[PDB]
Design an enzyme around this catalytic site. Structure first.
Site, PDB file in Angstrom:
ATOM      1  CG  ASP A  26      -1.737   1.249   1.363  1.00  0.00           C
ATOM      2  OD1 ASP A  26      -2.102   1.848   0.330  1.00  0.00           O
ATOM      3  OD2 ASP A  26      -2.013   1.649   2.514  1.00  0.00           O
ATOM      4  CG  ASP A  41      -4.164   4.165  -1.891  1.00  0.00           C
ATOM      5  OD1 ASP A  41      -3.617   3.044  -1.812  1.00  0.00           O
ATOM      6  OD2 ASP A  41      -4.765   4.707  -0.942  1.00  0.00           O
TER       7      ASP A  41
HETATM    8  C1  LIG Z   1      -2.430   5.122   8.670  1.00  0.00           C
HETATM    9  C2  LIG Z   1      -2.813   6.177   7.632  1.00  0.00           C
HETATM   10  C3  LIG Z   1      -1.717   6.396   6.583  1.00  0.00           C
HETATM   11  C4  LIG Z   1      -4.205   5.944   7.041  1.00  0.00           C
HETATM   12  C5  LIG Z   1      -4.369   6.484   5.619  1.00  0.00           C
HETATM   13  N1  LIG Z   1      -4.143   5.411   4.661  1.00  0.00           N
HETATM   14  C6  LIG Z   1      -5.118   4.500   4.489  1.00  0.00           C
HETATM   15  O1  LIG Z   1      -6.194   4.501   5.082  1.00  0.00           O
HETATM   16  C7  LIG Z   1      -4.763   3.417   3.459  1.00  0.00           C
HETATM   17  C8  LIG Z   1      -4.857   3.969   2.040  1.00  0.00           C
HETATM   18  N2  LIG Z   1      -4.569   2.959   1.032  1.00  0.00           N
HETATM   19  C9  LIG Z   1      -5.494   1.832   1.135  1.00  0.00           C
HETATM   20  C10 LIG Z   1      -5.426   1.161   2.503  1.00  0.00           C
HETATM   21  N3  LIG Z   1      -6.306  -0.004   2.581  1.00  0.00           N
HETATM   22  C11 LIG Z   1      -7.701   0.241   2.848  1.00  0.00           C
HETATM   23  C12 LIG Z   1      -8.621  -0.979   2.643  1.00  0.00           C
HETATM   24  O2  LIG Z   1      -9.831  -0.834   2.629  1.00  0.00           O
HETATM   25  N4  LIG Z   1      -8.010  -2.212   2.480  1.00  0.00           N
HETATM   26  C13 LIG Z   1      -8.802  -3.331   2.287  1.00  0.00           C
HETATM   27  C14 LIG Z   1      -9.089  -3.704   0.982  1.00  0.00           C
HETATM   28  C15 LIG Z   1      -9.886  -4.827   0.742  1.00  0.00           C
HETATM   29  C16 LIG Z   1     -10.391  -5.572   1.806  1.00  0.00           C
HETATM   30  C17 LIG Z   1     -10.104  -5.203   3.117  1.00  0.00           C
HETATM   31  C18 LIG Z   1      -9.313  -4.088   3.325  1.00  0.00           C
HETATM   32 CL1  LIG Z   1      -8.963  -3.632   4.942  1.00  0.00          CL
HETATM   33  C19 LIG Z   1      -6.542  -2.383   2.496  1.00  0.00           C
HETATM   34  C20 LIG Z   1      -5.758  -1.238   3.097  1.00  0.00           C
HETATM   35  C21 LIG Z   1      -4.280  -1.369   2.697  1.00  0.00           C
HETATM   36  C22 LIG Z   1      -5.874  -1.261   4.628  1.00  0.00           C
HETATM   37  C23 LIG Z   1      -5.619   2.151   3.655  1.00  0.00           C
END
Ligand SMILES: CC(C)CCNC(=O)[C@@H]1CNC[C@H](N2CC(=O)N(c3ccccc3Cl)CC2(C)C)C1
Ligand SMILES: *[C@@H]1O[C@H](CO)[C@@H](O)[C@H](O)[C@H]1NC(C)=O
Length: 335
Positions: free
Chosen positions: A38, A221
């Site tokens: 990510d 992203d």
């Molecule tokens: C800590 C800080 C940098 C927060 C800002 N950055 C972000 O929020 C991240 C921004 N890029 C995407 C990130 N994702 C969100 C998401 O919904 N994911 C996901 C995809 C499919 C199924 C389940 C999940 Cl959890 C995967 C992750 C990598 C957690 C969060």
């Protein structure tokens, strides 16, 4: 900045066009975990064996057990990662992580609290943040900053290739794979270092550039599955597509899918267009069935937001290279 001559690649598995993951190994002997790379965050974490089994997500994923690693180094400081769609919590640990043939001692979080929603819907076990330390939580050094420190990578950059469901995708550490892109790379500079975000000159949907006419921010992203904009923007954008908003996403009558207008993003002078096939999950052509779009609303808070986010929907069409050395991002047509 020592630049050696090694160029590693991480093979990725494409799950539903929404999750792209690869394998990494932690400890000795290696304990393998499926993770998402990510660019939107900067921490590395996997679920812990210390995670209460009352968290069903822990029951449904690989758990790191420090007691089976001789390379493990304790620490224990608490860590909480609050992402856009959910939060994870635990403590910091250190051990050796292997990614694409590279072995680097890394400080990562052992998650002991990961909610069923959304983690139960995760094919992957953990996340490998590819951002800058400025976004890292707990001030932990990102895994790439550490690999760059070993002075083995030919170049101080990494590239992402997302296929569309052969290999599901590919990440090249230290360069890019000319095999997965054609034409020239066209770069843009980051608004500020510390975040993989660039200025976006405008967004045109169809015949009218009705969005971001006075400029706006675009976050690139790799961990995001879709493309997102401010609720305000997406409503305008969706209003124009004729899509009706459901609880979590937008949809259209499947028969109406193919007739959807092109959508362009004006990045650094070059125009990046996506046809309906690029953003519509055309699972049917029936008028009696709904088809969801790979675009929804998301209001990222400052200092980062308000801002758009270009995820897998966008990267699937444009090979993406992240240049740490010159703090820029390059795009090329993916093949
Ligand atoms: C800590 C800080 C940098 C927060 C800002 N950055 C972000 O929020 C991240 C921004 N890029 C995407 C990130 N994702 C969100 C998401 O919904 N994911 C996901 C995809 C499919 C199924 C389940 C999940 Cl959890 C995967 C992750 C990598 C957690 C969060
Ligand atoms: C955890 O790592 C930090 C970062 O260097 C260090 O300052 C801290 O003392 C460590 N915690 C312990 C007590 O192991």
């Amino acid at each position: 900045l020592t630049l050696g001559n090694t160029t590693s690649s991480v093979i990725l598995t494409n799950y539903m066009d929404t999750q792209y993951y690869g394998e990494i190994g932690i400890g000795t002997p290696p304990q393998t975990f499926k993770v998402v790379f990510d660019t939107g965050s900067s921490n590395v974490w996997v679920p812990s064996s210390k995670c209460s089994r009352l968290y069903t997500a822990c029951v449904y994923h690989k758990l790191f057990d420090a007691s089976d690693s001789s390379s493990y180094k304790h620490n224990g400081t608490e860590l909480t990662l609050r992402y856009s769609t959910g939060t994870v919590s635990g403590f910091l640990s250190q051990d050796i992580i292997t990614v694409g043939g590279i072995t680097v001692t890394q400080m990562f979080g052992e998650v002991t609290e990961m909610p069923a929603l959304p983690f139960m819907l995760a094919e992957f076990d953990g996340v490998v943040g590819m951002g800058f330390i400025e976004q890292a939580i707990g001030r932990v050094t990102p895994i790439f900053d550490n690999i760059i420190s070993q002075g083995v990578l030919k170049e101080d950059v990494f590239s992402f290739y997302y296929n569309r469901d052969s290999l599901g995708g590919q990440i090249v550490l230290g360069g890019s794979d000319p095999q997965h892109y054609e034409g020239n790379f066209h770069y843009i500079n980051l608004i500020k270092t510390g975040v993989w975000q660039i200025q976006m000159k405008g967004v045109s949907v169809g015949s009218s550039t009705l969005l971001c006419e006075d400029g706006c921010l675009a976050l690139v992203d790799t961990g995001a599955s879709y493309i997102s904009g401010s609720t305000s923007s997406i409503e305008k954008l969706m209003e124009a597509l004729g899509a009706k908003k459901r609880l979590f996403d937008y949809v259209v009558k499947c028969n109406e899918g193919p007739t959807l207008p092109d959508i362009s993003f004006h990045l650094g002078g070059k125009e990046y267009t996506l046809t309906s096939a690029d953003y519509v999950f055309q699972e049917s052509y029936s008028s009696k069935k709904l088809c969801t779009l790979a675009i929804h609303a998301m209001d990222i808070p400052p200092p980062t937001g308000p801002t758009w986010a270009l995820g897998a929907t966008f990267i699937r069409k444009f090979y993406t290279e992240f240049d740490r050395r010159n703090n820029r991002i390059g795009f090329a047509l993916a093949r």
